[PDB]
Design an enzyme around this catalytic site. Structure first.
Site, PDB file in Angstrom:
ATOM      1  N   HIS A  45      25.464   8.993  -7.768  1.00  0.00           N
ATOM      2  CA  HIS A  45      26.785   8.518  -7.393  1.00  0.00           C
ATOM      3  C   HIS A  45      27.059   7.065  -7.753  1.00  0.00           C
ATOM      4  O   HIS A  45      28.211   6.691  -7.689  1.00  0.00           O
ATOM      5  CB  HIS A  45      27.129   8.776  -5.914  1.00  0.00           C
ATOM      6  CG  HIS A  45      26.432   7.856  -4.927  1.00  0.00           C
ATOM      7  ND1 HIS A  45      25.281   8.242  -4.261  1.00  0.00           N
ATOM      8  CD2 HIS A  45      26.785   6.593  -4.494  1.00  0.00           C
ATOM      9  CE1 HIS A  45      24.918   7.180  -3.444  1.00  0.00           C
ATOM     10  NE2 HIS A  45      25.853   6.182  -3.558  1.00  0.00           N
ATOM     11  N   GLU A  59      14.186  -9.696  -9.382  1.00  0.00           N
ATOM     12  CA  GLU A  59      15.328 -10.322  -8.719  1.00  0.00           C
ATOM     13  C   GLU A  59      14.958 -10.447  -7.274  1.00  0.00           C
ATOM     14  O   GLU A  59      14.374  -9.524  -6.741  1.00  0.00           O
ATOM     15  CB  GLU A  59      16.553  -9.430  -8.947  1.00  0.00           C
ATOM     16  CG  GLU A  59      17.839  -9.843  -8.275  1.00  0.00           C
ATOM     17  CD  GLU A  59      18.458 -11.099  -8.894  1.00  0.00           C
ATOM     18  OE1 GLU A  59      17.860 -12.146  -8.750  1.00  0.00           O
ATOM     19  OE2 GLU A  59      19.548 -11.029  -9.407  1.00  0.00           O
ATOM     20  N   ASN A  61      16.925 -13.412  -4.982  1.00  0.00           N
ATOM     21  CA  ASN A  61      18.215 -13.879  -4.478  1.00  0.00           C
ATOM     22  C   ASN A  61      19.336 -13.580  -5.480  1.00  0.00           C
ATOM     23  O   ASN A  61      19.240 -13.985  -6.640  1.00  0.00           O
ATOM     24  CB  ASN A  61      18.145 -15.361  -4.264  1.00  0.00           C
ATOM     25  CG  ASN A  61      19.294 -15.839  -3.389  1.00  0.00           C
ATOM     26  OD1 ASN A  61      20.444 -15.677  -3.754  1.00  0.00           O
ATOM     27  ND2 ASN A  61      18.965 -16.790  -2.525  1.00  0.00           N
ATOM     28  N   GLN A  64      21.030 -17.041  -6.796  1.00  0.00           N
ATOM     29  CA  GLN A  64      20.329 -18.234  -7.240  1.00  0.00           C
ATOM     30  C   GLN A  64      19.473 -17.866  -8.433  1.00  0.00           C
ATOM     31  O   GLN A  64      18.921 -16.801  -8.404  1.00  0.00           O
ATOM     32  CB  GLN A  64      19.394 -18.752  -6.144  1.00  0.00           C
ATOM     33  CG  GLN A  64      20.196 -19.289  -4.983  1.00  0.00           C
ATOM     34  CD  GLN A  64      19.237 -19.916  -3.965  1.00  0.00           C
ATOM     35  OE1 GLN A  64      19.654 -20.239  -2.842  1.00  0.00           O
ATOM     36  NE2 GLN A  64      18.054 -20.320  -4.453  1.00  0.00           N
ATOM     37  N   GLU A  69      13.805 -13.487 -13.109  1.00  0.00           N
ATOM     38  CA  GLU A  69      14.677 -12.379 -13.511  1.00  0.00           C
ATOM     39  C   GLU A  69      14.482 -12.039 -14.986  1.00  0.00           C
ATOM     40  O   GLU A  69      14.585 -12.979 -15.777  1.00  0.00           O
ATOM     41  CB  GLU A  69      16.169 -12.742 -13.240  1.00  0.00           C
ATOM     42  CG  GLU A  69      16.420 -13.147 -11.786  1.00  0.00           C
ATOM     43  CD  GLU A  69      16.211 -14.635 -11.533  1.00  0.00           C
ATOM     44  OE1 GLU A  69      15.478 -15.292 -12.241  1.00  0.00           O
ATOM     45  OE2 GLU A  69      16.981 -15.200 -10.771  1.00  0.00           O
ATOM     46  N   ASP A  93      21.441  14.034  -6.024  1.00  0.00           N
ATOM     47  CA  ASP A  93      21.861  12.644  -6.244  1.00  0.00           C
ATOM     48  C   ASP A  93      20.834  11.747  -6.909  1.00  0.00           C
ATOM     49  O   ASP A  93      20.160  10.999  -6.212  1.00  0.00           O
ATOM     50  CB  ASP A  93      22.411  12.055  -4.961  1.00  0.00           C
ATOM     51  CG  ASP A  93      23.205  10.764  -5.073  1.00  0.00           C
ATOM     52  OD1 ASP A  93      23.571  10.417  -6.169  1.00  0.00           O
ATOM     53  OD2 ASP A  93      23.545  10.177  -4.031  1.00  0.00           O
ATOM     54  N   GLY A 186      25.636  -0.403  -0.710  1.00  0.00           N
ATOM     55  CA  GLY A 186      24.936  -1.344  -1.606  1.00  0.00           C
ATOM     56  C   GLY A 186      23.420  -1.160  -1.610  1.00  0.00           C
ATOM     57  O   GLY A 186      22.777  -1.664  -2.552  1.00  0.00           O
ATOM     58  N   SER A 188      22.343   2.079  -1.822  1.00  0.00           N
ATOM     59  CA  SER A 188      22.340   3.350  -2.566  1.00  0.00           C
ATOM     60  C   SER A 188      21.622   3.326  -3.914  1.00  0.00           C
ATOM     61  O   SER A 188      21.599   2.309  -4.549  1.00  0.00           O
ATOM     62  CB  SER A 188      23.771   3.788  -2.847  1.00  0.00           C
ATOM     63  OG  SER A 188      24.465   4.225  -1.634  1.00  0.00           O
ATOM     64  N   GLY A 189      20.729   4.272  -4.213  1.00  0.00           N
ATOM     65  CA  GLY A 189      20.012   4.334  -5.482  1.00  0.00           C
ATOM     66  C   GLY A 189      18.664   3.668  -5.388  1.00  0.00           C
ATOM     67  O   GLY A 189      17.826   3.903  -6.229  1.00  0.00           O
TER      68      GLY A 189
HETATM   69 CA    CA Z   1      18.141 -14.561  -8.751  1.00  0.00          CA
END
Ligand code: CA
Length: 240
Positions: A45, A59, A61, A64, A69, A93, A186, A188-189
């Protein structure tokens, strides 16, 4: 995640952020699990919109520079052929996302360990949910990766009338339902990490919460059961 605590930077190195292109910006929309250097497992979804997606690994924050990353475009989306937008409660799903590039693995970027096919956990199995999702029902996203101790609730109980009834299938995992800790919009997944034989493995892909609220007593967060999907996952990756 409602009722989370902030994760340590290196605790859950398979967690990614799935982001979409929003004007000139990139917004967080979902979680995911890095399962190959070039493959992410997420919820169907979370890619029902025809948006431009990118995946962020390492990741911590959202807002920031963490210094860790790697930001990678999505080259192919494969949704489960049974997935129906209009029926989450049917299940399926799950989606695989092929990344434009392979990422580099380090202490911030690792692969998620998948269960053996057919694996069911016993009731009350120790698992964590992780996510940058809303930290209250109708609240806002978290800046830093939150974690929540969310023990499983077996099919027999979860499907019973007091709980989710018929909405939940045996292709799903239920975790939580204490009224205090949950998944929320947020998350989800993302992963549900569960400790089996001394190793965290990813048993669940976060799928839904109650319409009445995220943290609702006797409405556990509901996850796609990854172990239900191992032959599908493997067939997709061998053939793309
Ligand atoms: Ca970051």
């Amino acid at each position: 995640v409602v009722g989370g605590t902030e994760a340590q930077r290196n605790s859950w190195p398979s967690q990614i952020s799935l982001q979409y292109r929003s004007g000139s910006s990139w917004a967080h929309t979902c979680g995911g699990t890095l399962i190959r250097q070039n493959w992410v497992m997420t919820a169907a979804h979370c890619v029902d919109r025809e948006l431009t997606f990118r995946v962020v690994v390492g990741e911590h924050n959202l807002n920031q520079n963490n210094g860790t990353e790697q930001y990678v475009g999505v080259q192919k989306i494969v949704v489960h052929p049974y997935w129906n937008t209009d029926d989450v409660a049917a299940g399926y799903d799950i989606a695989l996302l092929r990344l434009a590039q392979s990422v580099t693995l380090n202490s911030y970027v690792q692969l998620g360990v998948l269960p053996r096919a057919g694996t069911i956990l016993a009731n009350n199995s120790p698992c964590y949910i992780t996510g940058w999702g809303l930290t209250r029902t109708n609240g806002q996203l978290a800046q830093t990766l939150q974690q929540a101790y969310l023990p499983t609730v077996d099919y027999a109980i979860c499907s019973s009338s007091s709980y989710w009834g018929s909405t939940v299938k045996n292709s799903m995992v239920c975790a939580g339902g204490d009224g205090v800790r949950s998944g929320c919009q947020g998350d989800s997944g993302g992963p549900l990490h569960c400790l089996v034989n001394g190793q965290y493995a990813v048993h669940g892909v976060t799928s839904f919460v109650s319409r009445l609220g995220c943290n609702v007593t006797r409405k556990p967060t509901v996850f796609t059961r990854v172990s239900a999907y191992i032959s599908w996952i493997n067939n997709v990756i061998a053939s793309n």
